[PDB]
Structures are given as C-alpha cells and as structure tokens.
Amino acid sequence: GSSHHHHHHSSGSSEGTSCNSIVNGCPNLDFNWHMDQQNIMQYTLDVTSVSWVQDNTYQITIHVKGKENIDLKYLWSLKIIGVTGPKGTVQLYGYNENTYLIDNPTDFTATFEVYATQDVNSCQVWMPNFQIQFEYLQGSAAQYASSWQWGTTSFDLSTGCNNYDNQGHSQTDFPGFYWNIDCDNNCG
Numbered sequence: 001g002s003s004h005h006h007h008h009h010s011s012g013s014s015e016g017t018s019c020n021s022i023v024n025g026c027p028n029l030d031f032n033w034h035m036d037q038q039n040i041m042q043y044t045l046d047v048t049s050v051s052w053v054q055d056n057t058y059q060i061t062i063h064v065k066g067k068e069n070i071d072l073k074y075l076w077s078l079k080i081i082g083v084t085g086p087k088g089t090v091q092l093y094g095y096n097e098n099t100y101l102i103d104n105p106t107d108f109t110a111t112f113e114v115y116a117t118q119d120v121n122s123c124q125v126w127m128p129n130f131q132i133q134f135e136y137l138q139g140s141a142a143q144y145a146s147s148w149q150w151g152t153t154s155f156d157l158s159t160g161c162n163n164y165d166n167q168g169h170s171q172t173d174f175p176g177f178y179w180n181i182d183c184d185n186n187c188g
C-alpha cells in the first residue's frame, strides 16, 4: 500500500498531512540571555516535522541540542511538561517511570501531539508553548557530581515568542513556531 503519508492511529488508521513550511516565529530575539542569567548551559530547539492528524491535532518532532556534550550518566530525568495536547506531560527519560526514550540529553529528538489553534493569520497557527524539565545529578546520577562542569543542574527550558523584555531578550529559552492550518500547503 501507500507510504507517501505518515500513518496515524485513528478512532483504525489515517493519512497524516505533512506541513511543508515550519516557521520560527521570532528568530531575532536573544534566547541565550535567559539561560545565561540562570547559569544554565545553552540549548537550542528546532521543530523538524509537523503532521496534521485530524481536528486541530498535529504530531510534531523536536530536536534539542546542548552547547557541550553531557553524557547520559549525569541525567536523572527529562520530560516535556505544560503541553497543550492529548498528553500534558511527555516523559523522555526517568528511572522512576521506566522510560528510556533518548540516549543523549544534549542531542535528542522527541515526537508528540499538540493542539495548535491560535491564528498567526488566516492560513497559519502557532505551536502551543511548552517546557522541557531537566534533572541532572539527582538519584544515582549524583555519584558523578565531581566531574560535572555545565552549571545549573535542575531547570526548565521554555518555548515561545510571546514573552520578552524591552531590549529583545526573550524570557523564554527557545523560539515559538508556526505552520499551516491542517497542513494544507495550498492555503492562501
């Protein structure tokens, strides 16, 4: 059968609709300032794919990269929180939760669903913002504290274009993003 479209589970299966243009909504804000002020190592986030499922639900993939490589042994837990979607929390790593879905907390991807409803214009909607909660050097990972050299060990990194100071420093750590409604690439 066809594999042009990514298939999704359906209330059954359905054809995903891939969005062609995934736009950083605020690439001229300074995001680094907000991590630097908290002594958090800089990270970046990109949205690398968006597929419309149905309704206003999209399956998105993110890619998160730290400035320096931090070995997995330092990590205790990693989760996406505050998600506007089917699941409000997406566990990525945690011994307590038997979850091992990444192998490098400084270079990882994650795929999850969001409800994207706030219009940019008549064709495009914003990603709803979320946070990524990192806990290093807790539990069993505390034993590696003597070689830790990357600053603050437990922190949340947030997305968005809607929170910045009067000098263009973001109060978020990562940009917000937008894409076409229903991933209809012919809108407009």
Ligand SMILES: [Mg+2]
Binding pocket: 005, 006, 007, 015, 016, 017, 018, 051, 052
């Ligand atoms: Mg698709």
Ligand code: NA
Binding pocket: 054, 055
């Ligand atoms: Na629909």
Ligand code: NA
Binding pocket: 025, 126, 127, 128, 129, 159, 160, 161, 175, 176, 177, 178
């Ligand atoms: Na956003």
